[PDB]
Amino acid sequence: MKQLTILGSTGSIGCSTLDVVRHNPEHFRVVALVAGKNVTRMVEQCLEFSPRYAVMDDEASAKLLKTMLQQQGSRTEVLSGQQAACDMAALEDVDQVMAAIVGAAGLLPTLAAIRAGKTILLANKESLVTCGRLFMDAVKQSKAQLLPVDSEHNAIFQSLPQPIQHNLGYADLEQNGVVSILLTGSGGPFRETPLRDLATMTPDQACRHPNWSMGRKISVDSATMMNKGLEYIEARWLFNASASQMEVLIHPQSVIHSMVRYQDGSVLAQLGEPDMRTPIAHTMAWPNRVNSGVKPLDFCKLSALTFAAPDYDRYPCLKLAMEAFEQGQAATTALNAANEITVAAFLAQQIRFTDIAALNLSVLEKMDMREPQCVDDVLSVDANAREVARKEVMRLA
Amino acid sequence: MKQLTILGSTGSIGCSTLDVVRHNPEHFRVVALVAGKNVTRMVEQCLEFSPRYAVMDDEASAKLLKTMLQQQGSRTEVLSGQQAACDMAALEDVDQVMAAIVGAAGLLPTLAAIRAGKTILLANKESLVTCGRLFMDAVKQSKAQLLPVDSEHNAIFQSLPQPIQHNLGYADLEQNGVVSILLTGSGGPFRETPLRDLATMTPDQACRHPNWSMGRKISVDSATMMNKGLEYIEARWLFNASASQMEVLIHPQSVIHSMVRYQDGSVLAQLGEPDMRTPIAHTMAWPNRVNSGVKPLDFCKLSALTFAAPDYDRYPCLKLAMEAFEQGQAATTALNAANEITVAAFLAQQIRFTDIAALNLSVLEKMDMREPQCVDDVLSVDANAREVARKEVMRLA
Ligand SMILES: O=CN(O)CCCP(=O)(O)O
Ligand SMILES: O=CN(O)CCCP(=O)(O)O
Ligand SMILES: [Mn+2]
Ligand SMILES: [Mn+2]
Structure with a gap:
């Protein structure tokens, strides 16, 4: 109880x-x-x-x-x-x-x-x-x-071995047999859109589009993959992984929520309906299970499953978030921050779609930061990044 | 050590x-x-x-x-x-x-x-x-x-919860949160062959065909799915499952080696290369892992993944095996027995491809068996089944 x-x-x-x-x-x-x-x-x-x-x-x-x-x-x-x-x-x-x-x-x-x-x-x-x-x-x-x-981390956690599950964060991947973690994501709705065309992308072409996706801001994050990349940041901390023990894969159908690679070649994975009651039920019931009222995945009534690597040219917000991690919690806190500004600028029609990537980039540059140290250092780095951001959307008026 | x-x-x-x-x-x-x-x-x-x-x-x-x-x-x-x-x-x-x-x-x-x-x-x-x-x-x-x-049970084992892994055979599925077990299989090379065409199938059409498949006799068991069906028998015993807690799925590409359904909708699965050193290394290192010299699954250089339910009209050897499990170890020892005969008759060209399904059936019928009780009872039921079988290939000379 x-x-x-x-x-x-x-x-x-x-x-x-x-x-x-x-x-x-x-x-x-x-x-x-x-x-x-x-x-x-x-x-x-x-x-x-x-x-x-x-x-x-x-x-x-x-x-x-x-x-x-x-x-x-x-x-x-x-x-x-x-x-x-x-x-x-x-x-x-x-x-x-x-x-x-x-x-x-x-x-x-x-x-x-x-x-x-x-x-x-x-x-x-x-x-x-x-x-x-x-x-x-x-x-x-x-x-x-x-x-x-x-959804992703829940799946990566369910796919991990036990002694790494009870010591979440301090459990060493590599020593416990993990070769790497497989962070998967749809790839956004502009995955097959010719590169010179992402600039002419409108907010209506990117906003709550089907097969495990429904949210104003994160659609632009799914579209730019600033979302995946940000889950790269949590993954890394959560599972205690180094950029070499990480992998980001484009899986358009989002059946496979994410995987974990092992030494003998085995790849452990989790799949189910996009319903959040599945991972909410897993976490709550753990280490046991309970019903959630979610649908048993009908592998028949299903799309074919494909994969691909992200094109860091087509999804700059992901290379940014990866390099951002390498710079410290000030760079990612400010990257998360400036991103909410810019995405927002894009949804209100102040900057092009392709401007979210470039601007989040800039703020990260135009800002010599210093690692935070509490829930306040982080708040501040956010209010300074928002400002370099709100002020950046501006030069494009 | x-x-x-x-x-x-x-x-x-x-x-x-x-x-x-x-x-x-x-x-x-x-x-x-x-x-x-x-x-x-x-x-x-x-x-x-x-x-x-x-x-x-x-x-x-x-x-x-x-x-x-x-x-x-x-x-x-x-x-x-x-x-x-x-x-x-x-x-x-x-x-x-x-x-x-x-x-x-x-x-x-x-x-x-x-x-x-x-x-x-x-x-x-x-x-x-x-x-x-x-x-x-x-x-x-x-x-x-x-x-x-x-390959399959290793995948289904890896996918089960821990307290069922350490008590293999007695760990109750359902009480530990398992909804059912997903036994997957390519579907054989005649999965899309029109039904009235299986009768005219030759041995060259079914023998060591690619993507995790290379063996004279099991190719015919892949083709008839007497192989999957026989793995339905071990599974039931191995994981302590009831025909309700079992599912057979056709997965042509054989990437996903097999899965495990859970109460909250989560489907856990194992994938990797068809190499046997992966499941051999997993079992040997357990509960840890070791390398095996196998290739890290390149999700990129990969086919699209689809699923389907077996058509019990197309694969009769699978319904036979499922009904055979329900009759006793005498019906399955004799089903495995008569199958090696028939398949073999097929490989030598004594009976049609579609004849393996019907003859294995017959021996199972024409033979009022009685559950074994040691390694001798099983050998016997095997010898009498082969005979009802060798003798059955015969009526078709
Ligand atoms: O929890 C759910 N998600 O992260 C889905 C968001 C869409 P994406 O996987 O393409 O980033
Ligand atoms: O261990 C390997 N297998 O079971 C593969 C046999 C071919 P099939 O999955 O179509 O029965
Ligand atoms: Mn997510
Ligand atoms: Mn097998």
Whole structure:
């Protein structure tokens, strides 16, 4: 009977984790729900699971949730602010923490759940893209169990050997028989578009396109593969890998979520439906399993499976993210940062598609950075990179 | 520093296991070599690895091997017959036993390795296709460690959870989160041949055809899928699965060696080159890994991957085998028996290709069998099945 705390219990991955707790009530219990402003879905969930706690980002919002919970009689106690969240993450009697609150918002609560040595359902990129050095040391220190929920990492983890699974981060790949890790990705919708044509690409040609893909910003990240590359950054930290023990493969159909290469030639892989309840269920049930309400992969009703290597000319955002890792957590925190600006510039139509790569590039250049050292060094490197970025979209007016 | 005994040190899988020991001398050592008649390759091997024992099938052979070893000064001691082999399999100081001696020749030494409770690199179909009830009960009794080397079971084993790997045969699938096991297979060379055309198939059309396939008799078992079907029989026994927890899938390219379905939708799979040194190295190094000298799978230089369900009208030898499992070890020992006859009749041109399916069927019918009870009951059911078969090829003269 595991007990959890969800950080971002109102977003996509939050509800999926709640749909997972719902169909498996015999093993899971909510002790705390943490959200941002959706007081609306939060009451519903507090009403359904009845966490001992509910936390919202501001008092304005809590004083209202506190109110609708009042209406229903929900004994659920309401708190507010960031501290409240970190306190739910470090909660004494809590077993796992679905670190699904994204952005910089989540760096501290994910960290507080880490510091407390808890099984961590790591459901946010930024935690390792910006605070990777810190976060992994915080794990060594307290022996917190990282369990990645991201489709790719979930698959790479499931495909790894056991003694590397219990020591996530300090488990040496190569000594335990791993030749390399196979990070796979669709390759974006402009994978076969002639190179001189990526410049004339519109936002409508890249935005939530089929077979495991549906999100405004990440479509441009799937399209530029700034997404894969950023998962290269987390992979490297998460699994303790060196650029030689890494591989990025274009797998258009996204059936194979990602693989792991071994010494004797065996390649271990994971596949299933794109549904996030699969990796949310795996991580929660581990080292056992539970149902999630997801479809058994019909290998018949399926597309043919192909692969390819990325063309670093067609996907510059990936070579950037690879070199960015080689420069330090300041270069990747600022690369993640400037990228959100630029992608955004592209979606509003301020710069060409091919300008996201070139500009994220520039900010990374025009900025002599120095490795961070806490959840604040990282915040700052982000606000300086955003600024070199917001200011860069500008010269193109 | 593991020490082994190889049963059938001269055949294909033997040499591959000898090539695995060669490139990893730091972890493996031969204590005994067991062959059949090839005194010729046996000397060379005895000369190279210097096992404390070499065993041949007859004194005639051994008095000659004993002689050429004399020539070179090989201290290796030479023995003969079956007892010798069983003794090499039960050897006190031996850790693993590559049970690669195939046929009925190997049921007892494989058994002797089992009884003595040793890590068993299982490399012969018959062991479970005929003596499945007995072999698994002998495993329970002495807690021997089966480690399948067959491309498919190796893939299905690698893909299972840990607590099912260490208790091979008794670890319940479903209770450990396994939904079913995906037994995959090319589909044979007549997978797309119109149905009324299988009857006019010749032996040159089905014999050692590319992409993980090279053998006179199994090519016909690939073509009829009597091979897949027979692997459905070992699987059921090996992994402790019910016909519901089993799935047979056609995968033409044979990249994916086989998979394992889980409750949360996750499908774990193994892929790699068709080389046998991969599963031979995995089983030998287990729970660790060693190199084997095989090629890192180039996902680039690869065909598109497709899947399909077998058409039980196209592959009758598969339904036969599935229904055969449901009748007892007498129906499967006799099905494996009659199949070697018929296939063989087909290879010699005594019956049509489509006749293998119908005759194996018949023998199974025309023969009210009764479940075996030792390595003798199985031999017998084999001899009476061959006869109902040799005699059946006959009515078509
Ligand atoms: O968790 C899901 N993804 O990472 C999918 C994003 C699309 P991509 O694999 O082409 O980057
Ligand atoms: O170990 C190897 N095999 O099983 C391959 C035999 C050919 P098939 O997969 O089509 O039965
Ligand atoms: Mn992902
Ligand atoms: Mn096989």
